[PDB]
Structures are given as C-alpha cells and as structure tokens.
Design a protein around this ligand. Sequence first.
Ligand SMILES: [Ca+2]
Ligand SMILES: [Ca+2]
Ligand SMILES: [Ca+2]
Ligand code: NA
Lengths: 4, 466
Amino acid sequence: XRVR
Amino acid sequence: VYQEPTDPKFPQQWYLSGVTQRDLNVKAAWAQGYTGHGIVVSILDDGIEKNHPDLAGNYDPGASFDVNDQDPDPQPRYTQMNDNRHGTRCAGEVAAVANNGVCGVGVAYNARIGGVRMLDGEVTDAVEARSLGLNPNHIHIYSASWGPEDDGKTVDGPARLAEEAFFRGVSQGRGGLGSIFVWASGNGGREHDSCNCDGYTNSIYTLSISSATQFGNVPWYSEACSSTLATTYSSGNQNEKQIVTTDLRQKCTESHTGTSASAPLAAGIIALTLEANKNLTWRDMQHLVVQTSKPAHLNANDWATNGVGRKVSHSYGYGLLDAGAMVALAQNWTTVAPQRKCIIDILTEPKDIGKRLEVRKTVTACLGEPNHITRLEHAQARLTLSYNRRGDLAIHLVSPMGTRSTLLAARPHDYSADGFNDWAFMTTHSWDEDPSGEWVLEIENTSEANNYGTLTKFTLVLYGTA
Ligand SMILES: [Ca+2]
Ligand SMILES: [Ca+2]
Ligand SMILES: [Ca+2]
Ligand code: NA
C-alpha cells in the first residue's frame, strides 16, 4: 503493498 | 454579513475561493453558515502532527490511533527525509484552524480532525480493518489518500477483514446512517493505470475522487475509470498553483500535490454537508454529489451525456464538487428509499473472446420482485475471464439508455496471464437511469497481436430504488  | 478567513495563506488557496469563479465554491457554503462544526473526520495515513499550530485547535484524540505501533498517539515518526509528512498535509486540507494567523484554512475549519497512523509499517488486512473500523459511532468521515501500487499492471483490493470493515461501516456506522469513506482515485496516470483495477476506489462503499489542474485539465497523474464519482482541484504543471496546507515540523507548505490532495478536500466538503444535514445516509451523500457536481470548466476528451441528461467523464466522474450547492441541496433533502440489489447472471455458456466479443441481454431489472429497480445507483459487471495478455483488453458496458461505461481501458504495462477472477467492475455513469432493457458488454483486443481467451462469467449487479 500500500502506497501514499 | 459573513467575514472570510484572515489567515496569511488563505489568499493562495485558489481552490477554496477565487475571483476566477474556477474553484470549489467553499466560501459560498461558509456564508450559508457551514464550517463543519460538530463533525468528526479521520485521516487514515502515515500519522498526524496533532501539536501542529494549525491543527491542535481541532485535533480530536477520539478520532485518532496508532495502528502501526499499537498505541493511541498518532504522532508521525520524524526522519531526515520527512517521509511521514503526508498524513499531516492531508489533515490540514480538511480542518486547518481559521483566523489564527497561521498558514491557511481547512475546508471544514470548525470540524474535529483526527488521524490514524497506519501507513508507516506493514499495511496488513488487519491494519486496514482496524483503521477503517475505528470508532464508527464517533467518526463520521474517513479519508484515505493511499491504496494499491499504481504500476498499471496490478489488480488489487481490500481483503476479508477490510471488506467486513467497509460493510459494517456503511451498515452500522454513524448510528446506522453509515460511515462516509472518501478515497483518492490514484496516481497511476503515467503508467496508464485504471482505477477500476483498484478495489478500494472501485467499491460502492467509497466515494472515489479524481483531480483537475488549476486551468481545468486532466493531470498527468490522473487515472480514468467508470467508478470515480467526482473531482476536486489539485496540482498540474509548474505554471499552475498547488495545494496549500499544514506540513510536518509545524511548517506550512504550498506544494501538496497529486491525487492525495483531492480526497481531503472532498472529505472537507462532505463534512460541511453533514453539518447542513446530520441525517444524511452514506447513499444520500453519494446522491448529493452526483446531482450537484459541475462539469463546466473542466476539459476532457470524453464528456458524454447519460440517460438522465447529466455529463460524465471517466477522468472526472460527474465533475467538480460544489460546496455551496452541496450544503444547499442537503437541507431540503429527503432520505432515499431502502437500497435494493438485483443480481442477473448473463452467460448460459462460456464465450470465446478472440479479437472482439459482444454480449447482449435484455433484463427486467427484477420486475415483479421486492428488489425491482427503476432508479439505478451503482452497477457492477462481475467478470471472470482468461486471457494471455490482460493489458491488451478493453471492456465496455452500455446501459439500455445508451450510456457507455468503459469498465477497463488498455493497460500497456499489464502483461499478466491471470485474467480476471470474478472482478467487480463498477460504474457510476448510469446513476438514476432505468436499468431495464438491453445491456451490452464489449470486450476487445486493442492490440494487433493474436491474443486468445475465454469469458466464463458475466454477472450484472444492479443497486438502486423503485
Ligand atoms: Ca505512537
Ligand atoms: Ca490557519
Ligand atoms: Ca491505481
Ligand atoms: Na468507490
């Protein structure tokens, strides 16, 4: 997996 | 009679209020008396600097938590590179304090803002679930400016616990009215990513929000898909201004960018709307957005008029949010009827895809049954198919009233051979249309390559009222  | 913000940076917050009439019309909502008082918003990100001079005044411990380190303090982890500044920037967009001589102001500058530190560590299903399900009866709106990687080749969504959290949220959150989940559609524009390959944005429980540059264009990072509901301003080229908000280490930034900045603004506007009518359900909220969003001013090569006369684009959804219009309509809004669900399995046999496949089907939308639908809301096309090169595929769904939703556009980087296993492509473009009639599914090979595959399942799922 999870990214900003 | 209303006096606007005196904050030093307010004048630079072009998206909130501007002579150019190319803004989110937020001042119009403030003038009507709405600033988010009494509403609780939580930012699910990499933390929140609760002691920031422009946030402390509105910080709410009850809407915060640290899932990464298992404690109630969501303070960011400081590092030389300032990696964990993201959540703080998003928080400021929603509820930065007003008239305090510091930086700018949030859309809902009187709302209570909280933060869940959950991106700074291993983001597991349990992690997402605890964040999405944090205090469903205290927190009204959840904002998420994160999601699956935007490499333009992956298909990913929430796991069991997260889904269960979404479902419990819209069912039981806010005393039954349902938690409002605002999501950023994604930054995979450069990789030709599709936000319908993102189970979070693609979900009917979340309001997926896209971006528009100051001059009204589709940003380079923007992803197109039929699941996006509306749009809010964000960054573009270097001649276009960006987002002004609170930054890590008690600073003020004028360069918050990308899809990350859009969701928070939507969350803020939705906060103002809830103050205008606290009895709005999670579905009522989506209705308000569809009805009040403005296309005008936004440039796109795919604006099309749906069956009910509204303009929709896969890059903007129903258009730019209008805070003034939102709070206005919210006041006289009559809660919609109970949500009905009509399931229609279409295939009676597998179908070869080849160069192009077309599947027609006349449906009655559950006529004569308790879940008969005449006024559509979300629509899903659950497909299960095999293909040698997934990215070469392009899928379209045409409603009886002629609205053409592109469920999936070509993704040149997607070389997967795993196809789609009961993936629920969702579209918001036929909202309010009568779903009965002939629906058409189109699957085509957008490449010259001799690809091959089989469509084994196509289930049409209609949500709505009568
Ligand atoms: Ca902590
Ligand atoms: Ca301020
Ligand atoms: Ca994406
Ligand atoms: Na969604």
